[PDB]
Design a protein around this ligand. Structure first.
Ligand SMILES: C[C@H](CCC(=O)NCCS(=O)(=O)O)[C@H]1CC[C@H]2[C@@H]3[C@H](O)C[C@@H]4C[C@H](O)CC[C@]4(C)[C@H]3C[C@H](O)[C@]12C
Lengths: 258, 129, 256, 256, 129
């Protein structure tokens, strides 16, 4: 262990007031709905909670961009098939603890609702309540995620305008290390509901929801059938001396089904 | 019919497709093959219990059973008309309570939808020839 | 001097079984559930049966088992947790005329009762509720949690309090009526005051208690399982061999 | 030791939703209504449906929506005011024999529940009331006011708590009976204790929630809409083309 | 769980609780008890001279908590289940061959012969089958 790193990026006083969670939506839902008091007790990794900063990235690249919701928790992304609604804040930990030789800074902003999506250049990601954290920090960086909202609750269908949490490579990643390799700091994201997160109205639990990350079949790729000629598959491989961007037409399907 | 698996001897093989409650027949999927034929000119229909995409989609996600049959509900995707109601027995074949005499073919542009688990004795609504 | 009223006839009595009070000093966690899952009666996955006039008295119309696979909310929630403990409460609805005349008897068979075949005189020896098929209102039972172990695991090869239903007197129509008039029934379940799970895991895998789902593939967009050609029709025929002995295209629903 | 009675089976539970208490600091006015509109159950404008023996289980017999267009008094009063907020209470009556044998299940579907098509196992997952078609007395439900906004506007393109009714078990006659015996139903509604409107405007225009009225013109005093001549008869004919593709004399009921 | 950086100094101490359905456990019957599972969360980023390639080693060491107990003194048995595999103290030259009834005259490696034979004598499982 050595402390030639950054001790902790202790969440600066981000300029934001406290936001009410389930205390506003409670006299407007016709049910008493509580979630397991042990889900609030440990930080589990997001469904979208894995990024990486290489030295081929440029200042301005968006490392992660995740809207406040129940899609930020494997626990609550599963509980949100039974309910239609939610409110409340979340607490996010950001785990970048790169090597002792790397150098660079990321900046994590708090983008409000209704802000136009798209570019979000590097000159303007600092105009939001942000936290500038070095990629060497040891201890995780707790940062809030408030439910700034115009209405009482949100419906558990992603067409909601909800507060994002954008992270942007602010200065590029470099390394002092004397030998022929630039390390690739690989961060992770952990999350847990705040003290007043709450779901709203128990509904039939349907599996085909906007959450429910992709699954693949448990079948070996040598019992599978081919998608361009009627035969089995006799081996998958990677070949750099071939047409790199081919224009095939069969066996080509989006992940969303079409 | 069972071909010659040994040269003249007995082998291990799956049990016959049964049994049924009194009044149920076997729902058959029907495909027509290529045939060398000297005299006739009709189509050689072969019948299966479950098509592919059902033998896959099993043995890829392994379900439990929790009962002796599944009550499916075949309905056409247009106008929501209910074609019939069948029992997918846990041994991977569909029974259908049909009390007619001759065949009865259904359209092949509906979607089976699992409704529930039903015990072995459940009594299906009859279909009308 | 008393009066013995000539009509009460119902209300199965219980002695409260302990839920999390036994499980607590041996489970790592004791996980509450939504306080509104206890308020509604939602339909059991196996909540389906029918009583035909060709059933003989003694037939077991259904045979459930106390688990979390009796409620579509607990079958969902039971993918995050590793085991459960607690009571439940069932109700059944029967849809019959004022012509049909039978009585069914819903019994609470304990665990480790020798699983053979109960007769008609032995079903009324359990805490039971007797009900005919002409009732308009649904009738309910407490499915308690008699157990030897401290809590159950949501991998159900453990024995639990069953709920057996027998056709007690034969179904026959007050009228000539029809001989194909089936009395549909339905089951509906909800936790009682003492249900809670045990140990938070990730939503584990596909699951057990996961309801079978069929692919959204119209049969004309399928493939025959005994010949490399698409499916070209659906039929039913009583004239063909009833029980063929095909070997290809056969599969259980559990994948084997 | 307790007794679990084997017959209660009903009474949907609620948690009180706030009415004017949320709307008050944001509406200009909060307008009471007659204290006797809360006392009577008057027939919904859409209070009409029928259950035939050719309906399959799953069919949605009706699908209302919490508004002031559920009560002919609030549909009238809602021409002076600009928006409403509050609960309601519905009851349905079913007119069946002691021969018909089905069960319907009236569910309280929340707002923003994905409007696709519910199955028969998913309808009992909402606060529901199950009732067969042989009941003599009308059965009632609280239609609460789950909402995201503080109050609703009487221009209904906003989502509100629906009331969906599904045919749960198929309608079939205990007797041979008739195959054309339809079970007529009716709906009836009234405000619950927490209903009141928002902002007095003039009786605005014609309105929405205004019931369609047809001109008092006997058809012989009319004009054909494909030729300049008076109407010279009424008929029905199954032999003529069933679905012609006329182009003149066509119009929606909303005027387009 | 517990998330440990690779570059920690002092050993990470953590409990291993006895979550169980029964009152006690039986020593002579492996049952289902709580596991510790260790997983590599984020990968290891270091330099490496030319050999070795700098692997980060790790070792788990346990002791009983303050309330471990055994239950009922029986007479000691020798055919237990925590009995490590011991081998005969016999030089191979004194042994006997398994495929041909003769002494054993030399043990050797040989990358030339069929690397995956299918012999049928001298096949056994270390568990005695
Ligand atoms: C040529 C088919 C008969 C010969 C046969 O069974 N197989 C030939 C090659 S293969 O084993 O099908 O792979 C005939 C009999 C069944 C026919 C089909 C069936 O009549 C169903 C539809 C009917 C449409 O009018 C035409 C396409 C079609 C899909 C037909 C295509 C094709 O003419 C088929 C497939």
């Amino acid at each position: 262990s050595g402390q030639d790193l950054v001790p902790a990026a202790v969440e600066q006083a981000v300029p934001i007031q406290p936001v009410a969670g389930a205390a506003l939506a409670a006299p407007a839902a016709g049910q008493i709905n509580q979630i397991d008091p042990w889900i609030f007790q440990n930080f589990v990794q997001c469904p979208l909670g894995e990024f990486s900063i290489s030295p081929r990235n440029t200042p301005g690249e968006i490392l992660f961009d995740l809207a406040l919701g129940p899609g930020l928790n494997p626990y609550l992304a599963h509980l949100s098939a039974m309910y239609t609604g939610w409110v409340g804040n979340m607490e996010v930990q950001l785990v970048l603890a790169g090597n002792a030789f790397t150098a660079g800074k990321v900046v994590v902003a708090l983008v409000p609702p209704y802000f136009p999506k798209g570019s979000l250049t590097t000159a303007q990601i600092t105009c939001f309540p942000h936290v500038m954290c070095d990629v060497r920090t040891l201890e995780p960086i707790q940062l809030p995620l408030l439910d700034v909202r115009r209405v009482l609750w949100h419906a558990t269908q992603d067409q909601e305008e909800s507060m994002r949490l954008v992270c942007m490579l602010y200065t590029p990643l470099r390394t002092n290390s004397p030998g022929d390799e630039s390390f690739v700091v690989s961060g992770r994201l952990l999350s847990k509901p705040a003290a007043d997160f709450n779901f709203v109205y128990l509904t039939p639990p349907i599996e085909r929801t906007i959450y429910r990350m992709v699954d693949l079949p448990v079948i070996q790729p040598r019992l599978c059938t081919h998608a361009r000629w009627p035969a089995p598959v006799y081996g998958l491989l990677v070949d750099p001396s071939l047409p790199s961007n081919p224009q095939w037409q069969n066996g080509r399907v989006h992940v969303d089904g079409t | 019919t069972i071909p010659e698996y040994n040269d003249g001897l007995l082998v291990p093989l799956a049990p016959p497709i049964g049994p049924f409650l009194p009044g149920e027949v076997l729902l058959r999927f029907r495909t027509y093959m290529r045939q060398i034929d000297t005299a006739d000119a009709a189509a050689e229909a072969i019948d299966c219990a479950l098509p592919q995409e059902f033998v896959s989609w099993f043995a890829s996600n392994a379900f439990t059973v929790q009962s002796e049959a599944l009550l499916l509900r075949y309905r056409n995707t247009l106008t929501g008309q209910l074609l019939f109601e069948c029992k997918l027995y846990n041994e991977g074949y569909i029974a259908l309570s049909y009390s007619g005499s001759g065949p009865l073919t259904f359209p092949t542009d509906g979607i089976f939808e699992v409704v529930s688990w039903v015990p072995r004795l459940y009594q299906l609504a009859s279909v009308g020839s």
